[PDB]
């Protein structure tokens, strides 16, 4: 079937991505976004050019075979398209439509995943294709052009358990300089699921096209983003509309990719990750917080977090 | 068997330690001092007391959101 003519989904517009693309579409050589999910439809015409690495960690076995890394569910393909669908004549367009993606398959065809597989996936995003975290020994991993580590790890998934080996891996990612982004969860709970709940991870809640928080969105997130009626890529070489904090997550990861790409383009370095409390323009998370559209009551609140991410303003903050 | 994840002091642990209790090694992490192991459910308490073992944790589940 003939591909449909390109449209910009409402959520891409909401997070103020299109005005950034004249500065960068995310296609800065050193920047990769690792999406830990159900895999990817790696030949999708609106994704293929941005799929830089395709791997699987299912059952505790690292595989780089296309057959093993391919998406048997659809969710990963959707998430990836929100971040990085190509700006061209077909389909949709991602927040960062030129960013390299590492698709790391940690969830099976059912969309279920073991924590062990997820932790292996995070390890793989740090190690990159070359199997080595920090080749030159300088302590610089994310943002080091000699290494192939991802700069963003995006986890549109969650569970109730807090395990120390998993947290240890999250800590390794953080110390590598990797911004970690995760869905808050879809149970209408008072706080985010794991790994979103870790201090080193940006928890993302979901808003609808009326700027209301989705009723399912777990509360006390760090930021929020479009997560209801989200059109994106879907297998096979097609498109689908979904809801969930899994759909909000990639919008944030895309914004981070734009920030880091723009910052590297200008300065030849990346910004530090930052912390939940940061309200400066000196870290990624600080920039996300200060530029977010503060919905609901003034200030951080349990529904929106700091607010709805806005790529245009974030990138200006980064480059200012 | 069940699948668990063992945290260790790498300098005080050798993965062969777990074989005598029916364990087998699934994955040795490169970036954290831990190993994913398949073992008899009855042997979990045994792992906890092995040289270099700091913690044994169950393999939990996450789902797509
Ligand atoms: Ca395909
Ligand atoms: Ca497109
Ligand atoms: Ca590497
Ligand atoms: Ca390095
Ligand atoms: Ca270096
Ligand atoms: Ca990189
Ligand atoms: Ca607010
Ligand atoms: Zn086994």
Curated annotation (Swiss-Prot), chain A:
User: Where is the Peptidase S8 domain positioned along the sequence?
Assistant: 9-315
The Gene Ontology biological process terms listed for this entry are: proteolysis
Q: Does the keyword Signal apply?
A: yes
Positions of the catalytic residues: 37 (charge relay system), 75 (charge relay system), 246 (charge relay system)
Q: Where in the cell is it found?
A: Secreted
GO-annotated molecular function: identical protein binding; serine-type endopeptidase activity
- What are the thermal characteristics recorded for this entry? Thermostable. Highly active at 80 degrees Celsius.
Entry GO terms, CC: extracellular region
pH-dependence of activity, as noted: Optimum pH is 9.5.
- Could you tell me the keywords of this UniProt record? Calcium, Hydrolase, Protease, Secreted, Serine protease, Signal, Zymogen
Entry annotated with the keyword Disulfide bond: no
Q: Which cofactor does it need?
A: Ca(2+)
Q: How does it assemble?
A: Monomer.
Similarity remark: Belongs to the peptidase S8 family.
Identification of the protein by name:
Tk-subtilisin
Q: What organism, scientifically named, is this protein from?
A: Thermococcus kodakarensis (strain ATCC BAA-918 / JCM 12380 / KOD1)
From Swiss-Prot, chain B:
Localization per record: Secreted
Q: Which domain of life is it from?
A: Archaea
User: Which residues are trimmed away as propeptide when the chain matures?
Assistant: 1-65
Disulfide bridges in this chain: none
| Entry function | Has a broad substrate specificity with a slight preference to large hydrophobic amino acid residues at the P1 position.
Q: Which family does it belong to?
A: Belongs to the peptidase S8 family.
The record's note on quaternary structure and interaction partners says:
Monomer.
This protein is called: Tk-subtilisin
Q: Report which part of the complete sequence is shown.
A: 29 to 93 of 422
